[PDB]
Amino acid sequence: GQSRLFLLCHKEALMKRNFCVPPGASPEVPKPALSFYVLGSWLGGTQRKEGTGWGLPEPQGNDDNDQKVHLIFFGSSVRWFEFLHPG
């Protein structure tokens, strides 16, 4: 198994959105779909599964880019909406 920790900062609303054309996909306009995304900051490197528990985190990437990530939720992952809160 693989894991990574992140701290939630702000959560957008849940509404119908029109996705972008995927890179290299067919030039067909996507149908509107229910989706939302959150903005969160990573707290460390990737952690590898170690039996029941998890191993020590890998060293954080020496990247000058800000430790910020966008997590786009859609499809069948929309069920996590009510379990996410800032802080």
Q: Residues 67, 73, 77, 78: what is their CA dihedral angle, to the nearest 10 degrees?
A: 120
| Residue labelled with tokens 């990437």 | 61
State the greatest distance between any 2 C-alpha atoms of the chain, in Å, as a whole number: 45
User: From its phi and psi, is residue 75 left (phi > 0), alpha (psi between -120 and 50) or beta?
Assistant: left
For residue 45, what are the contacts with CB-CB under 8 A and spacing of at least 6?
Answer: 4, 57, 58, 59, 60, 61
| Residue labelled with tokens 């779909």 | 33
Task: State the resolution, in angstroms.
Answer: 3.4
Instruction: Name the experimental technique.
Output: cryo-EM
Q: Give the integer Cα–Cα distance in Å for 13 and 68.
A: 19
Q: Residues 50, 56, 57, 60: what is their CA dihedral angle, to the nearest 10 degrees?
A: -150
